[PDB]
Structure 1
């Protein structure tokens, strides 16, 4: 399984924070927003990852994150010329994906909850079909909406329905088999002029292999689209971390716990950062 992080768009709602740079380079409490979805692909066991952004921001993600070798993974970069839809991720990434399975995650999505890694690994370990992740939300009409039966199996999926058939939004995290590339090539732009991830999901539903992992209320799927919600997301993260003395989406910690890097390698990473609390945290993990 490879992974893609779609991390472009203008981010106009956040202006002037995004006057020059992309929204996914902004802090969520104590680390850049993009760390969060990156950590989710890493916890899924995915080690070969493509980050897609705008022409002007793609090099800034590259400078921030590098090629991944210190995390024991491979990061690649590609540009999206215009934000013509989520599904364009698979066209942009066609060469990268090759004949592989692939997951897509939105650069601005933040997931958190007990047992989440098990769900991720299960999705990533699927050899066939698609896994989406549903989450009960206040205003489902603002999202992809998944309708499911009493055995948790999907009956419909609709992009921002006038009349939502359920309360469960389809969040920005998707796992696919290799059929997604030709599916994305064969869908056509909606009325808003975008290649819709919902139409990709529709294709898998028709194929009888659209699986939904429903995330209950013990999970947090956090909003980062407004200044207000960015701030709430940062406060949520702070409360979690300061109580536990454990960090959410610390990439180096994840690389170590996943076995991508060794203990000796982790200590090497902590050493040049020991003047700050993040470095000290990595060193304390090394001692665990």
Structure 2
């Protein structure tokens, strides 16, 4: 033994092309708000008001037009550009100076879910050091990072396994201490040309300082047509009040 927020809103959006030809996936509707508003509200609800937003050079104009300084939402934004869609871990690496010695909650912009994050953030704040991942039991684990759980302990995490050990998806909501940046520096682009967040989670795991919690409500990614539509249906009654209009 001071909590920062990070929303990763980069990527090409190729899977959703052409609805992402001009826009940027995280500015597409999810319910009555642009997708990215959900991540902002999740952090705000936990009193995490210092938030860094990462996106592509081309997309930054539109993202900033929506989010501004953050004053209208009761938060405070800082922006950085990710040159190429080189990976989640690469995007997170740009936030090193912003986080400093504090802890952070990282939310992948296309992850939409019902749980409040506060209970998890509070537990993590009571955790001496390390990281925490949030799990969701899913029907199609092959699409995600998958946690191999034995006797209530994570043995290993595997990214998009052809033969999943379980149905526990490691969601895109990560809680980290500042040590993550020193490890991000020991680079390895995977078979698909990316710095993998699963490698980071396994590093903390091997160090014996990774904890996890199973989420209670619904969760979905919004990066495919079917899952984007699902997120929209699930999000119908979500209301953020007059600050978010």
Per the normalisation by structure 1, the TM-score is 0.79
Q: Is contact 2:121–2:175 with CA below 8 Å preserved after alignment? A: no
Match of 2:147 in 1: 146
SS at 1:204 equivalent? helix
Structure 2 residue 188 is the aligned partner of structure 1 residue 182: no
SS at 2:120 equivalent? helix
Deviation at 1:33, TM superposition (A): 0.3
Change (3 A) 1:116 1:182: closer
Match of 1:65 in 2: 67
Match of 1:213 in 2: 213
Give 5+ residue unaligned stretches, structure 2: none
Structure 2 residue 230 is the aligned partner of structure 1 residue 232: yes
Distance 1:32 1:120 in 2: 24
Match of 2:199 in 1: 199
Distance 1:117 1:94 in 2: 23
What is the CA deviation profile of residues 95-115 of structure 1, one whole-angstrom value per residue up to 9, with x for unaligned ones? 2122221221101110113x6
Q: Is contact 1:2–1:97 with CA below 8 Å preserved after alignment? A: yes
Structure 2 residue 46 is the aligned partner of structure 1 residue 44: yes
Change (3 A) 1:57 1:125: farther
Deviation at 1:127, TM superposition (A): 4.9
Distance 1:97 1:13 in 2: 31
What is the CA deviation profile of residues 180-219 of structure 1, one whole-angstrom value per residue up to 9, with x for unaligned ones? 0111111311111100000000110011011111124xx1
- Bigger Cα Rg: 1
Match of 1:258 in 2: none
Higher relative contact order (CA 8 A, sep 6+): 2
Match of 1:75 in 2: 77
SS at 1:192 equivalent? coil
SS at 2:182 equivalent? helix
Higher helix share: 1
Q: Is contact 1:44–1:124 with CA below 8 Å preserved after alignment? A: no
Alignment partner for residue 25 of structure 2, among 23, 26, 30? 23
SS at 1:39 equivalent? helix
Match of 2:100 in 1: 98
What is the CA deviation profile of residues 107-159 of structure 1, one whole-angstrom value per residue up to 9, with x for unaligned ones? 1110113x653234433564511010111111212110111233x32111111
Distance 2:28 2:160 in 1: 27
Distance 2:41 2:128 in 1: 22
Change (3 A) 1:177 1:116: closer
Q: Is contact 2:132–2:175 with CA below 8 Å preserved after alignment? A: yes
Give 5+ residue unaligned stretches, structure 1: 242-246, 254-268, 271-277, 280-288
Q: Is contact 2:133–2:174 with CA below 8 Å preserved after alignment? A: yes
Alignment partner for residue 110 of structure 1, among 93, 109, 112? 112
Distance 1:117 1:103 in 2: 11
Across the aligned residues of Structure 1 and Structure 2, the Cα RMSD in angstroms comes to 1.9
How many residues are matched? 243
Distance 1:79 1:135 in 2: 30
